[PDB]
């Protein structure tokens, strides 16, 4: 939606599942979506084509982030790993599998170890 007038602008679409977490690149060039359709999705909106580039992942997305230097995205998916991409050359450049690096558990009525 447009802030300055309020009436709806554009239903972006393309997503094989609900869209899970969203953010703008801090310059404002890029909208980034992550959805549970295993996929993260570069929406360039304010260009004259309102284009889309896919990014296939391994599983569902959970959270997105940008770098203040607006070249890099960090998406945190469901296996638990982080995957770090550079936006322009849409290539993955880094990854961290942090499952044991975060597991702390054993709740009440949590009958797994």
């Amino acid at each position: 939606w447009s802030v300055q007038t309020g009436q709806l602008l554009d239903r972006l679409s393309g997503h094989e599942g609900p869209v899970s977490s969203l953010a703008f690149a801090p310059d404002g060039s890029v909208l980034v979506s992550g959805s549970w359709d295993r996929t993260a999705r570069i929406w360039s909106i304010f260009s004259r084509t309102q284009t889309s580039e896919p990014l296939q992942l391994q599983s569902d997305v959970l959270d997105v982030a940008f770098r203040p230097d607006s070249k890099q995205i960090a998406i945190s998916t469901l296996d638990g790993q982080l995957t770090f991409w550079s936006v322009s050359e849409a290539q993955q450049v880094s990854g961290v599998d942090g499952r044991r690096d975060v597991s702390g558990g054993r709740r009440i009525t949590d009958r797994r170890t």
């Binding site: 239903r11 679409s13 997503h15 094989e16 359709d37």
Partner: protein, 297 residues
């Protein structure tokens, strides 16, 4: 997504069979309600089915509101009828030919919110997938024979009904040199329909006229430059595309600008393009005794 569309579409089918039972009921319920206002006596079974009377006392308001036209019926169109703009893509057959591709360009132009698409090397199941991942109103095919289009195939997506029709008597846009023809206006055309008098006629008009954008309702009868017509006789619906200027409150001039079709619809399925295992709704019955005598539409 995919489990979701399977979920909803089957729920539509099952709710139809539900509507069958309950409308068989409401037939009886109708006669009760009329009698109360009328005081005319009634059928004694209706007078003495007890669950029916109590259920009347609950379910009055649906009947009277439907009499009012207060609601539109449950429908694969009624969910989003005049709310949001239907975007529509037109695709050719697998390996298109050039004159066909030009004619498809013509009917893309006639619609106002369309895209064409080069079909190329694309499995038609995955073209349905592209649909249900871009939330289209409508897919549309074209099949030529030899430079001349023969059949179109409207589907309503996400899961709706499909028309499939032959074409005949076609003229292109591209038999006329551009010195006489020209770029045609992408204004939201009006629609008119003549002679659809079956409930099946209203089915086919429903699947047609939910293609086009919603008109704005304030001055629509006054404004507007462009009018699309569907008229039908001998179950061969003929459709033209005209543009007009109003020279008087008593006089007007028309110009004919689209392609001229006659199509005769030969398959209407509550069921999309891939699903050949779906429930057809009316097919064109030659080969029978009086498939030539009777008409639908």
């Amino acid at each position: 997504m995919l489990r979701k569309q399977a979920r909803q579409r089957r729920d539509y089918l099952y709710r139809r069979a539900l509507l069958l039972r309950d409308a068989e009921i409401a037939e009886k319920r109708a006669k009760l309600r009329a009698a109360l206002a009328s005081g005319k006596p009634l059928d004694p079974k209706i007078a003495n089915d007890k669950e029916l009377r109590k259920d009347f006392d609950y379910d009055v308001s649906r009947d009277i509101a439907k009499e009012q036209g207060e609601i539109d019926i449950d429908d694969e169109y009624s969910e989003l009828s005049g709310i949001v703009d239907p975007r529509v893509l037109v695709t050719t057959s697998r390996d298109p030919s050039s004159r066909l591709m030009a004619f498809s360009k013509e009917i893309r132009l006639m619609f106002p919110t369309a895209i064409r698409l080069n079909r190329g090397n694309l499995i038609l199941p995955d073209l349905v997938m592209s649909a249900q991942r871009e939330r289209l109103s409508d897919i549309i095919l074209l099949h030529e024979h030899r430079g001349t289009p023969t059949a179109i195939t409207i589907s309503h997506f996400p899961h709706g009904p499909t028309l499939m029709a032959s074409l005949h008597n076609v003229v292109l846009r591209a038999d006329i040199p551009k010195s006489i023809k020209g770029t045609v206006s992408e204004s939201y055309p009006h629609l008119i329909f003549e002679g659809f008098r079956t409930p099946l006629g209203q089915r086919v008009v429903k699947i047609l006229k939910h293609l086009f954008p919603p008109r704005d309702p304030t001055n629509n009868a006054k404004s507007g430059n462009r009018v699309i017509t569907f008229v039908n006789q001998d179950d061969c619906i003929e459709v033209r595309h005209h543009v007009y200027v109003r020279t008087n409150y008593n006089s007007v001039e028309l110009s004919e600008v689209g392609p001229r079709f006659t199509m005769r619809p030969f398959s209407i399925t509550m069921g999309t393009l891939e699903n050949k295992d779906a429930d057809v709704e009316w097919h064109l019955s030659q080969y029978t005794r009086t498939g030539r005598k009777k008409n639908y539409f």
